[PDB]
Amino acid sequence: MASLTEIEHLVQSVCKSYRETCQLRLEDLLRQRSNIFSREEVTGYQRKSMWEMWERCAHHLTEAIQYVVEFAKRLSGFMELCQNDQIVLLKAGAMEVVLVRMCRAYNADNRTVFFEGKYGGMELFRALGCSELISSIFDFSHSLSALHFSEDEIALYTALVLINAHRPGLQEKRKVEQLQYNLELAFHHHLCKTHRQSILAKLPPKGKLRSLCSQHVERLQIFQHLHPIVVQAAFPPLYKELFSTTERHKILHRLLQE
Protein backbone atom coordinates (compact mmCIF):
# COMPACT_ATOMS: atom_id res chain seq x y z
CA MET A 1 0.00 0.00 0.00
CA ALA A 2 0.83 3.73 -0.68
CA SER A 3 4.14 4.44 -2.49
CA LEU A 4 5.98 7.79 -2.04
CA THR A 5 4.27 9.20 -5.19
CA GLU A 6 0.79 8.21 -3.84
CA ILE A 7 1.69 10.20 -0.60
CA GLU A 8 2.96 13.18 -2.60
CA HIS A 9 -0.23 13.14 -4.74
CA LEU A 10 -2.24 12.92 -1.49
CA VAL A 11 -0.53 16.10 -0.11
CA GLN A 12 -1.46 18.06 -3.20
CA SER A 13 -4.99 16.61 -3.10
CA VAL A 14 -5.72 17.53 0.62
CA CYS A 15 -4.32 21.08 0.09
CA LYS A 16 -6.46 21.53 -3.06
CA SER A 17 -9.64 20.26 -1.24
CA TYR A 18 -8.92 22.70 1.63
CA ARG A 19 -8.19 25.78 -0.58
CA GLU A 20 -11.43 25.06 -2.51
CA THR A 21 -13.58 24.67 0.66
CA CYS A 22 -12.57 27.68 2.88
CA GLN A 23 -15.51 29.92 3.85
CA LEU A 24 -13.11 32.97 3.79
CA ARG A 25 -9.81 33.81 1.98
CA LEU A 26 -6.78 34.22 4.34
CA GLU A 27 -5.65 37.19 2.19
CA ASP A 28 -9.01 38.99 2.84
CA LEU A 29 -8.95 38.16 6.62
CA LEU A 30 -5.46 39.73 6.95
CA ARG A 31 -6.49 42.90 4.99
CA GLN A 32 -9.51 43.38 7.32
CA ARG A 33 -7.27 43.28 10.52
CA SER A 34 -7.35 47.14 10.73
CA ASN A 35 -11.24 47.10 10.45
CA ILE A 36 -11.91 46.96 14.25
CA PHE A 37 -15.37 47.52 15.87
CA SER A 38 -16.08 50.93 17.54
CA ARG A 39 -17.04 51.06 21.27
CA GLU A 40 -20.64 52.05 20.09
CA GLU A 41 -20.82 48.90 17.87
CA VAL A 42 -19.34 46.87 20.84
CA THR A 43 -22.05 48.36 23.13
CA GLY A 44 -24.62 47.41 20.45
CA TYR A 45 -23.59 43.72 20.61
CA GLN A 46 -23.41 43.82 24.44
CA ARG A 47 -27.00 45.24 24.60
CA LYS A 48 -28.42 42.44 22.34
CA SER A 49 -30.51 39.64 23.98
CA MET A 50 -28.87 36.32 24.98
CA TRP A 51 -31.07 34.43 22.56
CA GLU A 52 -30.31 36.88 19.66
CA MET A 53 -26.54 36.35 20.13
CA TRP A 54 -26.95 32.54 20.27
CA GLU A 55 -29.08 32.57 17.11
CA ARG A 56 -26.45 34.70 15.28
CA CYS A 57 -23.59 32.48 16.53
CA ALA A 58 -25.44 29.18 15.68
CA HIS A 59 -26.00 30.64 12.21
CA HIS A 60 -22.29 31.55 11.63
CA LEU A 61 -21.21 28.17 13.01
CA THR A 62 -23.70 26.35 10.72
CA GLU A 63 -22.23 28.32 7.75
CA ALA A 64 -18.67 27.15 8.69
CA ILE A 65 -19.85 23.52 9.16
CA GLN A 66 -21.40 23.54 5.68
CA TYR A 67 -17.93 24.19 4.18
CA VAL A 68 -16.33 21.49 6.43
CA VAL A 69 -18.91 18.95 4.99
CA GLU A 70 -17.75 20.07 1.50
CA PHE A 71 -14.07 19.62 2.64
CA ALA A 72 -14.95 16.04 3.77
CA LYS A 73 -16.75 15.28 0.44
CA ARG A 74 -13.64 16.39 -1.53
CA LEU A 75 -11.25 14.61 0.86
CA SER A 76 -9.61 11.57 -0.84
CA GLY A 77 -11.08 8.34 0.57
CA PHE A 78 -13.91 9.92 2.63
CA MET A 79 -16.72 9.15 0.12
CA GLU A 80 -15.44 5.50 -0.10
CA LEU A 81 -16.35 5.16 3.62
CA CYS A 82 -19.85 3.91 4.46
CA GLN A 83 -22.59 6.52 5.11
CA ASN A 84 -22.67 5.49 8.87
CA ASP A 85 -18.89 6.17 9.23
CA GLN A 86 -19.29 9.45 7.20
CA ILE A 87 -21.94 10.63 9.74
CA VAL A 88 -19.96 9.37 12.76
CA LEU A 89 -16.79 11.22 11.60
CA LEU A 90 -18.59 14.50 10.69
CA LYS A 91 -20.89 14.48 13.79
CA ALA A 92 -17.75 14.44 15.95
CA GLY A 93 -15.11 16.23 13.81
CA ALA A 94 -16.88 19.06 11.94
CA MET A 95 -16.90 21.38 15.03
CA GLU A 96 -13.26 20.46 15.73
CA VAL A 97 -12.28 21.37 12.10
CA VAL A 98 -14.18 24.71 12.52
CA LEU A 99 -12.24 25.44 15.76
CA VAL A 100 -8.89 24.75 13.98
CA ARG A 101 -9.95 26.83 10.84
CA MET A 102 -10.94 29.65 13.27
CA CYS A 103 -7.29 30.64 14.09
CA ARG A 104 -7.03 32.22 10.57
CA ALA A 105 -9.83 34.69 11.68
CA TYR A 106 -7.91 35.37 14.97
CA ASN A 107 -5.48 38.28 15.38
CA ALA A 108 -2.87 37.45 18.08
CA ASP A 109 -1.38 41.06 18.04
CA ASN A 110 -4.51 42.49 19.73
CA ARG A 111 -6.77 39.70 20.94
CA THR A 112 -9.50 39.98 18.29
CA VAL A 113 -11.53 37.71 16.03
CA PHE A 114 -13.26 38.48 12.68
CA PHE A 115 -17.02 38.43 13.37
CA GLU A 116 -19.89 39.87 11.26
CA GLY A 117 -17.68 42.13 9.10
CA LYS A 118 -15.16 43.57 11.58
CA TYR A 119 -12.57 42.48 14.20
CA GLY A 120 -13.55 42.48 17.88
CA GLY A 121 -12.40 41.01 21.20
CA MET A 122 -14.10 38.77 23.80
CA GLU A 123 -16.33 41.62 25.06
CA LEU A 124 -18.34 41.40 21.78
CA PHE A 125 -19.83 38.04 23.03
CA ARG A 126 -20.86 39.11 26.61
CA ALA A 127 -24.63 38.48 26.08
CA LEU A 128 -24.09 34.72 25.41
CA GLY A 129 -23.53 34.15 29.11
CA CYS A 130 -20.80 31.60 28.43
CA SER A 131 -17.60 33.49 29.29
CA GLU A 132 -15.61 30.32 30.21
CA LEU A 133 -16.31 28.77 26.71
CA ILE A 134 -15.48 32.13 24.94
CA SER A 135 -12.22 32.28 26.95
CA SER A 136 -11.37 28.62 26.07
CA ILE A 137 -12.02 29.40 22.30
CA PHE A 138 -9.83 32.56 22.39
CA ASP A 139 -6.96 30.69 24.22
CA PHE A 140 -7.22 27.76 21.79
CA SER A 141 -6.92 30.09 18.77
CA HIS A 142 -4.09 32.00 20.56
CA SER A 143 -2.12 28.76 21.11
CA LEU A 144 -2.55 27.81 17.40
CA SER A 145 -1.38 31.33 16.24
CA ALA A 146 1.94 30.62 18.05
CA LEU A 147 2.63 27.64 15.70
CA HIS A 148 2.46 30.02 12.62
CA PHE A 149 0.74 27.42 10.40
CA SER A 150 0.92 27.66 6.63
CA GLU A 151 -2.36 27.06 4.70
CA ASP A 152 -1.01 23.61 3.66
CA GLU A 153 -0.29 22.73 7.32
CA ILE A 154 -3.93 23.62 8.34
CA ALA A 155 -5.16 21.55 5.32
CA LEU A 156 -3.19 18.41 6.32
CA TYR A 157 -3.84 18.85 10.09
CA THR A 158 -7.71 19.33 9.70
CA ALA A 159 -7.85 16.27 7.37
CA LEU A 160 -6.49 14.20 10.35
CA VAL A 161 -8.71 15.96 13.00
CA LEU A 162 -11.66 14.68 10.88
CA ILE A 163 -10.28 11.21 9.85
CA ASN A 164 -9.92 9.86 13.44
CA ALA A 165 -10.14 6.02 13.67
CA HIS A 166 -10.83 6.21 17.52
CA ARG A 167 -14.39 7.62 17.18
CA PRO A 168 -17.00 5.48 18.97
CA GLY A 169 -19.50 3.96 16.51
CA LEU A 170 -17.29 3.24 13.50
CA GLN A 171 -18.53 0.16 11.54
CA GLU A 172 -15.48 -0.26 9.21
CA LYS A 173 -12.76 0.80 11.76
CA ARG A 174 -9.90 -0.75 9.66
CA LYS A 175 -11.00 1.20 6.55
CA VAL A 176 -10.78 4.52 8.56
CA GLU A 177 -7.38 3.33 10.03
CA GLN A 178 -5.86 2.95 6.55
CA LEU A 179 -7.20 6.40 5.47
CA GLN A 180 -5.87 7.92 8.75
CA TYR A 181 -2.43 6.23 8.19
CA ASN A 182 -2.07 7.60 4.65
CA LEU A 183 -3.14 11.12 5.73
CA GLU A 184 -0.69 10.98 8.71
CA LEU A 185 2.10 10.02 6.19
CA ALA A 186 1.05 12.92 3.87
CA PHE A 187 1.20 15.42 6.82
CA HIS A 188 4.52 14.02 8.15
CA HIS A 189 6.10 13.88 4.63
CA HIS A 190 5.16 17.53 3.95
CA LEU A 191 6.45 18.51 7.45
CA CYS A 192 9.78 16.68 6.77
CA LYS A 193 10.22 18.30 3.26
CA THR A 194 9.41 21.81 4.64
CA HIS A 195 11.61 21.36 7.81
CA ARG A 196 8.60 21.81 10.11
CA GLN A 197 8.62 18.47 12.04
CA SER A 198 9.12 20.60 15.25
CA ILE A 199 5.41 21.67 15.29
CA LEU A 200 4.29 18.01 16.03
CA ALA A 201 5.23 18.21 19.74
CA LYS A 202 3.83 21.82 19.90
CA LEU A 203 0.32 20.75 18.55
CA PRO A 204 -2.57 20.92 21.10
CA PRO A 205 -3.54 17.65 22.87
CA LYS A 206 -6.63 15.79 21.52
CA GLY A 207 -8.22 16.53 24.93
CA LYS A 208 -8.32 20.31 24.36
CA LEU A 209 -10.55 20.07 21.18
CA ARG A 210 -12.77 17.43 22.90
CA SER A 211 -13.33 19.79 25.89
CA LEU A 212 -14.28 22.78 23.64
CA CYS A 213 -16.97 20.63 21.96
CA SER A 214 -18.17 19.16 25.25
CA GLN A 215 -18.41 22.73 26.72
CA HIS A 216 -20.33 23.91 23.65
CA VAL A 217 -22.87 21.05 24.03
CA GLU A 218 -23.14 21.81 27.80
CA ARG A 219 -23.72 25.57 27.29
CA LEU A 220 -26.26 24.89 24.44
CA GLN A 221 -28.35 22.60 26.72
CA ILE A 222 -28.45 25.46 29.34
CA PHE A 223 -29.61 27.91 26.63
CA GLN A 224 -32.21 25.36 25.29
CA HIS A 225 -33.63 25.06 28.84
CA LEU A 226 -34.15 28.88 29.14
CA HIS A 227 -35.25 29.48 25.49
CA PRO A 228 -36.43 26.10 23.99
CA ILE A 229 -38.61 27.62 21.27
CA VAL A 230 -35.75 29.91 20.14
CA VAL A 231 -33.92 26.61 19.42
CA GLN A 232 -37.09 25.03 17.81
CA ALA A 233 -37.96 28.15 15.72
CA ALA A 234 -34.79 30.18 15.02
CA PHE A 235 -31.82 27.69 15.17
CA PRO A 236 -30.51 26.11 11.94
CA PRO A 237 -31.77 22.49 11.52
CA LEU A 238 -28.22 21.20 10.74
CA TYR A 239 -27.05 22.77 14.10
CA LYS A 240 -29.94 21.10 16.01
CA GLU A 241 -29.18 17.75 14.30
CA LEU A 242 -25.38 17.76 15.27
CA PHE A 243 -25.68 19.36 18.79
CA SER A 244 -29.27 19.45 20.35
CA THR A 245 -29.81 15.91 22.01
CA THR A 246 -28.41 7.62 8.15
CA GLU A 247 -30.98 7.37 11.09
CA ARG A 248 -31.27 10.64 13.21
CA HIS A 249 -29.14 12.69 10.69
CA LYS A 250 -31.45 13.45 7.70
CA ILE A 251 -29.83 16.90 6.90
CA LEU A 252 -26.22 15.57 7.07
CA HIS A 253 -27.31 12.63 4.82
CA ARG A 254 -28.95 14.95 2.22
CA LEU A 255 -25.77 17.17 2.26
CA LEU A 256 -23.62 14.04 1.66
CA GLN A 257 -25.97 12.69 -1.10
CA GLU A 258 -25.38 15.72 -3.42
Please provide the distance, in angstroms rounded to a whole number, between the alpha carbons at the two ends of the chain: 30
Q: What's the CA gap between 200 and 119, in Å, rounded?
A: 30
Q: Which of 14, 15, 22, 88 binds ligand O5A (CB under 6 A)?
A: 22
How many beta carbons lie within 10 A of that of residue 253, not counting itself? Answer: 16
Angle between helices 50-74 and 151-162 (to 10 degrees): 90
- Using the rule CB under 6 A, is 216 a contact of ligand O5A? yes
CB 91 within 8 A of CB 252: yes
CB 176 within 8 A of CB 170: yes
Q: Which of 98, 159, 176, 256 binds ligand O5A (CB under 6 A)?
A: 98
How many beta carbons lie within 10 A of that of residue 94, not counting itself? Answer: 25
Q: What's the CA gap between 9 and 195, in Å, rounded?
A: 19
Q: Which of 115, 121, 199, 208 binds ligand O5A (CB under 6 A)?
A: 115
- Using the rule CB under 6 A, is 230 a contact of ligand O5A? no
- Using the rule CB under 6 A, is 105 a contact of ligand O5A? yes
- Closest contact distance (angstroms) between CB of 170 and ligand O5A is 25
- Using the rule CB under 6 A, is 90 a contact of ligand O5A? no
- Using the rule CB under 6 A, is 156 a contact of ligand O5A? no
- Using the rule CB under 6 A, is 32 a contact of ligand O5A? no
Strands 106-107 and 118-120: unpaired
- Using the rule CB under 6 A, is 100 a contact of ligand O5A? no
Burial class (CB in 10 A: 0-12, 13-18, 19+), 249: buried
Residues 116-155, one symbol each (x = binds ligand O5A by CB under 6 A, - = not), give ---------x--x-x--xx--x------------------
Candidates 101-109, 168-176, 200-208, 224-232; binding stretch for ligand O5A (CB under 6 A)? 101-109
State the number of binding residues for ligand O5A (CB under 6 A): 22
Candidates 79-87, 97-105, 148-156, 180-188; binding stretch for ligand O5A (CB under 6 A)? 97-105
Q: Which run of H or E residues covers position 120?
A: strand 118-120
Where do contacts with ligand O5A occur on this chain (CB under 6 A)?
22-24, 57-58, 60-61, 64, 67, 98, 101-102, 105, 113, 115, 125, 128, 130, 133-134, 137, 216
